[PDB]
Structures are given as structure tokens and as C-alpha cells.
């Protein structure tokens, strides 16, 4: 039996095509996963190849929670520390946020999606350590989903990284993975530190995954990610009525790729929804404005289809 849930699949398709239309986009993709089993509930693409599987993207801000999580798990930072987050340069190359945040704690780094903060946390680890961590998340490790033209992704050997490259990978540029590989990686956050393999078949019990983070680390990071979708966070466009939503939004240059990925209920997650809109030419181009609304309706609808009850009153 296939894990595909046709009610979610149809919702994904309808909300995908609507969003692609309004933004006058080249193409798009949606992945919906069971957050506790890794089952693929929906996989929707606009006409052409299976892009969810075949097209490698730079994850941008969507990688940031993993770097934060690794720094907390290793004890290289904590929730009290405040980092100087002034923009900086490494040699001629700059690292900067969207605003000058002079200092931020770890919650602030997630909430404001700080390149500077995330890059300084990554810099507490050696290149080799970060390379192995990215490889362990599945980056550069092909899924063998059984589709033609599947991507392995891009993960350059750590021996060839310049110190600027480590920093830029920590905020999601210079490594690449499919949307399906990215949605997979989020299972390490949702399933209490345990990365799941993903499946196109129904699973009567969660498969054996592998531990990436301590359960306490994963729980703490999910709580931090809710700040992203509440006022003051960069991802308010993916807020869902009735629920706490942990999410990230991102925009990559190639013309842009707009991405929004998240999970809910944040404390006890049941669904991961990932949306990518390729080359929006109308009504905005940022991940929040372009991919946030389809994410918001697909997540809200999935929760309802699956009968998950709201955790807070409906405004």
C-alpha cells in the first residue's frame, strides 16, 4: 500500500497551482511528510519532471535550525548566551543580516534568521565536523527513490573549503539538496532528534532512524522555531490559526527560488510541509510572501484532514 494520502495530495496540487498562477512562476513543488514516521503523504509538482526529487536547490535559511541545534547539542552555546551579531568580513567577503542586530541570543538568531549569528555558531566547529554533520543529514547522499534523474546533491570535500565557505554553508549557500532531502532532514527536528529514512509505503510502526540530536535539543529547537511564525519573526506568513508552527523561509538566487518549510503542532509535530516556488515573476519573490500562503493553507488543511485538534483558540 502506498503512503500517498489522496486528500492531502489533492490539497497540495490545488494550493500549489494557485500559488504558481498568482506569482506567475516557472514551476513549483510541495512535499508533505508524516513528521513521526517519515511517510510521504504528498508529493506534488507542476508539469514536467519530479522536481521534488530531481532538482537540487540551495536551502538558504532552511538549514539554519540544524546549525543552531548542533551548537546546542555539542554545548558550544546555550540559551543564555548573547552573541555580537554585527556584520563582519572574512578577508574581502562579507557576512551580514537583513538588519544590523548588534547582539542576539540564540532565540533571536532563529527568530531574525541571522546569517551572522548562525555563521559564528558554525565557526565553533571545524570544517571537517561540519562536513560530516551535513553528510549525516543526508546532504550529498542520494535517496534512491527510484526516479530517473535523481540528484545526490552537492557537498564539497571539507579539505577544499575556504573559511568564508563554511560560513556561507551555515546559512544555506554552496551546498545543495532536493526538496525531498530537505523535508527528510526536518524529521531530525520533529522526531525528537531522530532522522528517518522516508518511505513511499505505509509503515505500521515508525522505522528505525538514526540519532542526530539529543531529544532535549530537538524539543528546545522546535520551541525556538515557533518564534519564526509569531510577530517579530521572519515567517509570520506561515502562521496557522489554532496551532503553534515552527518554520523557516528562504530565498535563493540562481531570478529566485522561494521556499517555506515547517511543521505543526510544533510541540508534538504530526506534519511537515515543504513548498518551493521556482522563479516567481509577480506579487513578490521572497519565501515568506510567495511560499508562505500555500504552506499556510496546505498545513492548515492537512491538520484538519488528519483530524489533529487545535492547541489554542481560533481567532
Domains and CATH numbers, the chain: 1-315 (3.40.710.10)
List the catalytic residue out of 3, 61, 178, 227: 61
- Sign of the torsion angle spanned by Cα atoms 102, 106, 111, 115: positive
Q: How far apart are CA 262 and CA 240, in angstroms?
A: 11
- Cβ neighbours of residue 125 closer than 8 Å, sequence gap 6 or more: 70, 71, 74, 76, 133
Give the chain's largest Cα–Cα span. 55
- Cβ neighbours of residue 181 closer than 8 Å, sequence gap 6 or more: 138, 139, 141, 143, 153
**Nearest partner of 294 among 30, 52, 24, 62, judged by Cα:** 30
| 72 burial via Cβ count (<10 Å: 0-12, 13-18, 19+) | buried
Q: How far apart are CA 109 and CA 210, in angstroms?
A: 27
**CB-based contact 240:299 (threshold 8 Å):** yes
Q: How far apart are CA 285 and CA 272, in angstroms?
A: 23
**Nearest partner of 257 among 198, 183, 176, judged by Cα:** 176
Q: In units of Å, what resolution does this entry have?
A: 1.9
Q: How far apart are CA 131 and CA 169, in angstroms?
A: 10
Helix residue spans in 25-94 (DSSP H): 51-54, 64-73
- Cβ neighbours of residue 174 closer than 8 Å, sequence gap 6 or more: 58, 154, 156, 165, 168
Cα-Cα-Cα-Cα torsion 124, 129, 132, 136, nearest 10 degrees, comes to -50
Q: Is 61 a catalytic site residue?
A: yes
Q: How far apart are CA 117 and CA 174, in angstroms?
A: 18
Q: How far apart are CA 218 and CA 221, in angstroms?
A: 5
Q: How far apart are CA 128 and CA 145, in angstroms?
A: 28
Q: What is the DSSP letter of 309?
A: P
The cell for 91 is 578577508
The owner of cell 509503515 is: 203
Amino acid at each position: 500500500a502506498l503512503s500517498l494520502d489522496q486528500r492531502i495530495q489533492t490539497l497540495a496540487y490545488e494550493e500549489l497551482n494557485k500559488a504558481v498562477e498568482y506569482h506567475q512562476a516557472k514551476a513549483g513543488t510541495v512535499v508533505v511528510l508524516d513528521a513521526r514516521t517519515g511517510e510521504i503523504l504528498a508529493l506534488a509538482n507542476t508539469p514536467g519532471r519530479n522536481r521534488a526529487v530531481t532538482d537540487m536547490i540551495e536551502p538558504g535559511s532552511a538549514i539554519k535550525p540544524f546549525v543552531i541545534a548542533k551548537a546546542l547539542d555539542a554545548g558550544k552555546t546555550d540559551l543564555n548566551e548573547r552573541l555580537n551579531t554585527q556584520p563582519y568580513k572574512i578577508g574581502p567577503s562579507p557576512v551580514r543580516d537583513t538588519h544590523v542586530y548588534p547582539s542576539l541570543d540564540v532565540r533571536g538568531i532563529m527568530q531574525k534568521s541571522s546569517n551572522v549569528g548562525t555563521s559564528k555558531l558554525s565557526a565553533r566547529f571545524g570544517a571537517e565536523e561540519m562536513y560530516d554533520f551535513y553528510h549525516e543529514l543526508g546532504i550529498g547522499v542520494r535517496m534512491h527513490s527510484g526516479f530517473p534523474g535523481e540528484t545526490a546533491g552537492l557537498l564539497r570535500n571539507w579539505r577544499r573549503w575556504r573559511p568564508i565557505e563554511q560560513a556561507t554553508m551555515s546559512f544555506g549557500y554552496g551546498l545543495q539538496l532536493s526538496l525531498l532531502q530537505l523535508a527528510r532532514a526536518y524529521t531530525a527536528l520533529t522526531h525528537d532528534g531522530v532522522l528517518l529514512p522516508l518511505s513511499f509505503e505505509k509503515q505500521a510502526v515508525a522505522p528505525q532512524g538514526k540519532r542526530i540530536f539529543k531529544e532535549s535539543t530537538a524539543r528546545e529547537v522546535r520551541n525556538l522555531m515557533v518564534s519564526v511564525t509569531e510577530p517579530g519573526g521572519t515567517g509570520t506568513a506561515g502562521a496557522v490559526d489554532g496551532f503553534d508552527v515552527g518554520a523557516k523561509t528562504g530565498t535563493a538566487r540562481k531570478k529566485h527560488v522561494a521556499t517555506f518549510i515547517g511543521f505543526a503542532p510544533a510541540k508534538n509535530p504530526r506534519v511537515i510541509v515543504a513548498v518551493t516556488i521556482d522563479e516567481p515573476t509577480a506579487h513578490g519573490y521572497y519565501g515568506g510572501v510567495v511560499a508562505g500562503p500555500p504552506f499556510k493553507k496546505i498545513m492548515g488543511g492537512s491538520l484538519n484532514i488528519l483530524g489533529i485538534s487545535p492547541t489554542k483558540p481560533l481567532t
